[PDB]
Amino acid sequence: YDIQAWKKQCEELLNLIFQCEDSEPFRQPVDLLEYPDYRDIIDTPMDFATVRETLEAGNYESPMELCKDVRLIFSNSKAYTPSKRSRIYSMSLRLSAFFEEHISSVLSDYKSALRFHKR
Protein backbone atom coordinates (compact mmCIF):
# COMPACT_ATOMS: atom_id res chain seq x y z
CA TYR A 1 0.00 0.00 0.00
CA ASP A 2 2.93 2.34 -0.75
CA ILE A 3 1.40 5.55 -2.13
CA GLN A 4 4.77 6.69 -3.54
CA ALA A 5 5.86 3.43 -5.22
CA TRP A 6 4.57 4.39 -8.67
CA LYS A 7 7.37 6.92 -9.19
CA LYS A 8 10.29 4.45 -9.23
CA GLN A 9 8.06 1.94 -11.09
CA CYS A 10 7.54 4.59 -13.82
CA GLU A 11 11.25 5.46 -13.87
CA GLU A 12 12.05 1.76 -14.45
CA LEU A 13 9.38 1.42 -17.16
CA LEU A 14 10.76 4.53 -18.93
CA ASN A 15 14.28 2.97 -18.73
CA LEU A 16 12.91 -0.14 -20.50
CA ILE A 17 11.22 2.04 -23.15
CA PHE A 18 14.41 4.04 -23.79
CA GLN A 19 16.41 0.75 -24.12
CA CYS A 20 14.33 -0.52 -27.02
CA GLU A 21 14.74 0.41 -30.67
CA ASP A 22 11.02 1.12 -31.10
CA SER A 23 11.28 4.22 -28.91
CA GLU A 24 13.89 6.02 -31.05
CA PRO A 25 11.40 8.27 -32.97
CA PHE A 26 9.76 9.24 -29.66
CA ARG A 27 12.78 9.93 -27.37
CA GLN A 28 13.10 13.63 -28.21
CA PRO A 29 10.59 16.23 -29.54
CA VAL A 30 9.70 15.76 -33.25
CA ASP A 31 12.19 17.64 -35.49
CA LEU A 32 10.13 20.47 -36.98
CA LEU A 33 12.74 21.04 -39.74
CA GLU A 34 12.33 17.46 -41.03
CA TYR A 35 8.48 17.63 -40.67
CA PRO A 36 7.53 21.31 -41.29
CA ASP A 37 3.76 20.72 -41.10
CA TYR A 38 3.92 18.96 -37.69
CA ARG A 39 2.47 21.80 -35.54
CA ASP A 40 -0.31 22.26 -38.16
CA ILE A 41 -1.66 18.79 -37.18
CA ILE A 42 -0.37 18.31 -33.63
CA ASP A 43 -1.54 20.77 -30.94
CA THR A 44 0.50 19.33 -28.07
CA PRO A 45 3.81 17.67 -28.85
CA MET A 46 5.03 15.06 -26.35
CA ASP A 47 8.05 12.76 -26.15
CA PHE A 48 9.64 10.34 -23.63
CA ALA A 49 12.44 12.73 -22.56
CA THR A 50 9.79 15.32 -21.60
CA VAL A 51 7.84 12.65 -19.68
CA ARG A 52 10.99 11.48 -17.84
CA GLU A 53 12.02 15.09 -17.09
CA THR A 54 8.52 15.93 -15.78
CA LEU A 55 8.65 12.86 -13.54
CA GLU A 56 12.19 13.61 -12.28
CA ALA A 57 11.28 17.25 -11.54
CA GLY A 58 8.45 16.06 -9.26
CA ASN A 59 5.85 17.53 -11.60
CA TYR A 60 3.55 14.50 -11.84
CA GLU A 61 1.21 14.09 -8.87
CA SER A 62 0.08 10.57 -9.92
CA PRO A 63 0.88 7.81 -12.42
CA MET A 64 -2.43 8.67 -14.17
CA GLU A 65 -0.94 12.04 -15.19
CA LEU A 66 2.20 10.31 -16.54
CA CYS A 67 0.00 7.81 -18.37
CA LYS A 68 -2.00 10.68 -20.04
CA ASP A 69 1.28 12.18 -21.37
CA VAL A 70 2.62 8.83 -22.63
CA ARG A 71 -0.73 8.14 -24.34
CA LEU A 72 -0.41 11.59 -26.00
CA ILE A 73 2.88 10.45 -27.62
CA PHE A 74 0.97 7.55 -29.20
CA SER A 75 -2.13 9.56 -30.19
CA ASN A 76 0.15 12.21 -31.81
CA SER A 77 1.84 9.45 -33.85
CA LYS A 78 -1.57 8.12 -34.93
CA ALA A 79 -2.77 11.61 -35.90
CA TYR A 80 0.42 12.54 -37.81
CA THR A 81 0.87 9.25 -39.69
CA PRO A 82 -0.07 9.44 -43.38
CA SER A 83 -0.81 5.67 -43.22
CA LYS A 84 -1.72 3.08 -40.62
CA ARG A 85 1.04 0.91 -42.22
CA SER A 86 3.82 3.55 -41.75
CA ARG A 87 7.13 2.63 -40.08
CA ILE A 88 7.01 5.17 -37.24
CA TYR A 89 3.32 4.52 -36.50
CA SER A 90 3.94 0.73 -36.46
CA MET A 91 6.75 1.29 -33.90
CA SER A 92 4.31 3.40 -31.82
CA LEU A 93 1.72 0.56 -31.75
CA ARG A 94 4.26 -1.97 -30.46
CA LEU A 95 5.56 0.49 -27.87
CA SER A 96 1.97 1.34 -26.82
CA ALA A 97 1.09 -2.33 -26.31
CA PHE A 98 4.20 -2.83 -24.16
CA PHE A 99 3.49 0.36 -22.17
CA GLU A 100 -0.17 -0.56 -21.50
CA GLU A 101 0.81 -4.09 -20.48
CA HIS A 102 3.18 -2.72 -17.82
CA ILE A 103 1.44 0.45 -16.62
CA SER A 104 -1.72 -1.47 -15.63
CA SER A 105 -0.27 -2.84 -12.37
CA VAL A 106 1.35 0.54 -11.57
CA LEU A 107 -2.05 2.27 -11.81
CA SER A 108 -3.87 -0.50 -9.94
CA ASP A 109 -1.34 -0.52 -7.08
CA TYR A 110 -1.45 3.27 -6.78
CA LYS A 111 -5.27 3.45 -6.71
CA SER A 112 -5.33 0.53 -4.22
CA ALA A 113 -2.81 2.39 -1.98
CA LEU A 114 -4.98 5.53 -2.01
CA ARG A 115 -8.09 3.51 -1.14
CA PHE A 116 -6.24 1.86 1.76
CA HIS A 117 -5.10 5.29 2.99
CA LYS A 118 -8.68 6.58 2.89
CA ARG A 119 -9.99 3.38 4.69
Ligand X SMILES: COc1cc(Br)ccc1CC(=O)O
Query: What is the binding site for ligand X (CB under 6 A)?
Result: 16-17, 19-20, 22, 25-26, 30-31, 35, 77, 80-81, 86, 88-89, 94-95, 98
Minimum separation from the CB atom of position 19 to ligand X (A): 6
Query: Looking at beta carbons only, is 15 or 112 nearer to ligand X?
Result: 15
Residue type, 41: I
Query: Looking at beta carbons only, is 104 or 112 nearer to ligand X?
Result: 104
Question: Residue 12 and residue 7: Cα distance in Å, rounded?
Answer: 9
Is residue 62 within 8 Å of residue 6, measured between CB atoms? Answer: yes
Say if residue 95 is exposed, middle or buried (CB neighbours under 10 Å; 0-12, 13-18, 19+). Answer: buried
Query: Looking at beta carbons only, is 98 or 107 nearer to ligand X?
Result: 98
Is residue 41 within 8 Å of residue 80, measured between CB atoms? Answer: yes
Minimum separation from the CB atom of position 81 to ligand X (A): 4
Minimum separation from the CB atom of position 63 to ligand X (A): 18
Minimum separation from the CB atom of position 12 to ligand X (A): 11
Residue type, 109: D
Query: Looking at beta carbons only, is 81 or 113 nearer to ligand X?
Result: 81
Is residue 50 within 8 Å of residue 27, measured between CB atoms? Answer: no
